[PDB]
Design an enzyme around this catalytic site. Structure first.
Site, mmCIF file in Angstrom:
data_model
loop_
_atom_site.group_PDB
_atom_site.id
_atom_site.type_symbol
_atom_site.label_atom_id
_atom_site.label_comp_id
_atom_site.label_asym_id
_atom_site.label_seq_id
_atom_site.Cartn_x
_atom_site.Cartn_y
_atom_site.Cartn_z
ATOM 1 N N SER A 296 0.928 -1.298 -0.043
ATOM 2 C CA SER A 296 -0.006 -0.004 0.032
ATOM 3 C C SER A 296 0.933 1.287 -0.015
ATOM 4 O O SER A 296 1.903 1.271 0.600
ATOM 5 C CB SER A 296 -0.783 0.065 1.242
ATOM 6 N N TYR B 294 -2.033 -0.949 10.003
ATOM 7 C CA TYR B 294 -2.066 -1.248 8.627
ATOM 8 C C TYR B 294 -0.624 -0.796 8.026
ATOM 9 O O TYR B 294 0.083 -1.468 7.243
ATOM 10 C CB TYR B 294 -3.340 -0.535 7.740
#
Lengths: 243, 244, 243, 243
Positions: free
Chosen positions: C138, C152
């Protein structure tokens, strides 16, 4: 020649002045460079002398290679040695890339990058093991979170690359090279209040501007003899802007 | 006139530049290339682009002068009436410990490896529109300087990373992307893969090899595509794992 | 065993599905994993078969090591070879760090990092020179521009480090390892509408969400035999968010 | 509760022990965690007490979430406050990725990343404005220059991401989060001996291992009340390895 000597470019006000005083307290004799305001420079000289250290102010255009060379030369003529170089002088152009002129491009390159390169070469004529090269970069070298700072971000990211390469070259000689990366720091010229500052503040995690001492203490930390294993490093002092 | 996208590749007369020019031509771009002096190498690239069905022109220009940087764009726009991609490939590789560098080497590398990109980009934006592509050829050494001697080069190439990020941020809403390709050691005529020096550099790569010009050309082609509209501010290492 | 085989984890919908179809068009036979939703998996299988390629769907909980191992094992039983692994399955916990539970911590580590690691180890029992390991990271692995994504961001930064180490290990074996780093991508599950999306979008330079094809194309570019010199790389496909 | 309290995980030996003594000298009361080796822990306790500070050793398995929670709980029970958390405990697996077992993978994740996450959540039940979270990462989180360190590089790059996200979350609360990244440091636990150490030294620009004080000084610099504008930062102390 009994004390270590530090040369701080643009050491007449703001971050530069605070670095000069902090290093003087750490036991360095001090040379600072200034472009125009002799009185601000002499004020810093006096404050360093009030601490018991020697200080000298050298007039020099950091945008000229002759000025870059003369800053080192005059420092070495005044003190006979050079132990730390802090490349702090710089400018901050602001505006969309499509409107930038050749003159703005040359000016920012000459002062924010070429100066550091030329001054570093000249310093290495004099610097010995235990030497310190410290570049004042910017957090914007790592993150450009809003429009208008392409030229600045380029020069400041350039300093990171330069630092890595120089650190690699000088490692076995016992000279370190590191970059400090300020976020927005409140000074006379850069106030923490107002709508423009609010926009910048919102990109910091602390939602605040820092202060000149936040940078000066980090330069002091790197300039110490005990920092001999820190080289090639970048230290963000940015209130979490790059986070 | 003006039916095809136009790409300007600086230093496009040989090596990586030439390969980029041929690959973009095969993707459907008409081509302008700059060269400093070897007109014959430039004309060879022009002919090979024409053999692929495109129009091509070679523009003589000193990338180290701002007048040359402005002229490259100006002449490309005069020849074709549009500009759709700028690939800033021209550059120089000074080598030596920092204490042995001269003022002249410092100015020359800054002028060609960073100032040129900046000035060419400003000029290109007079003509470029939505769908435009700015692609800078950086280096893996902009991210890692694993041996002595490359401080100046590393500085300029890291500079291009920062420039790319800032330009991407400025042009995002205009639909122009800006990205940097970062080659490791690539074999060319001038930079051969054999010999003891190359064996040292190669050991820093994970693949223990030099790359080939097609490795960089392919990556440029990937970024220059209209389908690459969501890629901006990116750096792509093509370096055999050198920076790992 | 006439065609290269790609295993895509979480390949039944969204980014995973789009990768599976794009690689099928590039000439890979396809295995996908799914946790739940057999019908969505069978639709992907049909679309791949419509293109003339062989496809299988393997049920597997990516959050269990037995599932991680079985995904590879069942793929190799169905096709007799393995040429690309795309670790796409993952989750996105959101909330302030002080509120995160042990269960959320374990779940995100298990699925976003442990899965990739265990699957990679198993894949290397079968993969040969020309192989491709592609991790879906990401943009938030590189920039955490707003609060709530500490877990995350940790796992996705972890993939970057894993990618670098694996690339280094596998270099001389002719297997590459690379990470694709999506920004916000519109899917069924991540709509693009609403005040939350408007906030995220403002951090991108394009002021937009991307689409699944933006990621599929990138995976295809990396999985090609001509991408043999690309290893250790990260590719941001993020509309300038990390800029 | 008159002095600030620092909890240092794995503080019985090597880098941890040095950090504990340096923070004691800065004026912190000290809690350290140890897995086994009570006598080493009791030695550190005695040296902290010789400086006039209070110290306690807490037995805890850093690889267990109950141990992660208990470290904070027992620290707060002993002292009534918590001001700094230093997550130093960790392990260094070494070997080619294809030979890594599920048990090694879990272990490294549990100790190098889950521990920090769970300890951080528990610490935030007690910490207040002026708090400090300092993670001991590694230079190998940024550069994996040789084969055999995939797992370690993943976990240490993960900490960088975790630090960035946590810094972003806690910015307005006046708690900082930063990561120190040691290169090779000569320790009682990790001696500068053998062919593996010889290979690692050659990647540093200084061609040397550092010493524990190089890290302890840096933790001390970050833990200061004057370090408030530093957050989200990583500080390489690696002799130029990542250059």
């Amino acid at each position: 020649m009994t004390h270590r000597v530090a040369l701080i470019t643009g050491g007449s006000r703001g971050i530069g002045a605070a670095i000069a005083l902090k290093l003087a307290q750490d036991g360095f004799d001090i040379a600072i460079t200034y472009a125009r305001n002799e009185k601000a420079a002499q004020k810093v000289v006096s404050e360093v002398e009030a601490l018991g250290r020697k200080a000298v102010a050298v007039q020099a255009d950091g945008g000229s290679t002759d000025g870059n060379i003369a800053a080192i030369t005059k420092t070495h003529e005044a003190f006979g040695r050079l132990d730390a170089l802090v490349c702090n002088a710089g400018i901050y152009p602001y505006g969309p890339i499509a409107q930038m002129t050749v003159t703005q491009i040359e000016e920012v390159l000459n002062l924010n990058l070429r100066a550091a390169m030329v001054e570093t070469v000249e310093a290495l004529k004099y610097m010995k093991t235990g030497g310190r090269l410290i570049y004042i970069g910017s957090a914007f070298g790592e993150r450009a979170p809003f429009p208008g700072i392409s030229l600045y971000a380029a020069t400041k990211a350039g300093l990171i690359g330069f630092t890595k390469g120089v650190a690699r070259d000088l490692g076995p000689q016992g000279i370190t090279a590191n970059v400090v990366e300020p976020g927005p720091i409140a000074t006379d010229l850069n106030p923490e209040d107002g709508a423009a500052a609010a926009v910048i503040r919102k990109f910091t995690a602390t939602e605040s501007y820092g202060k000149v001492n936040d940078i000066a203490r980090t330069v002091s930390f790197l300039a110490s003899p005990d920092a001999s294993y820190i080289t090639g490093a970048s230290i963000l002092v940015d209130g979490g802007l790059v986070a």
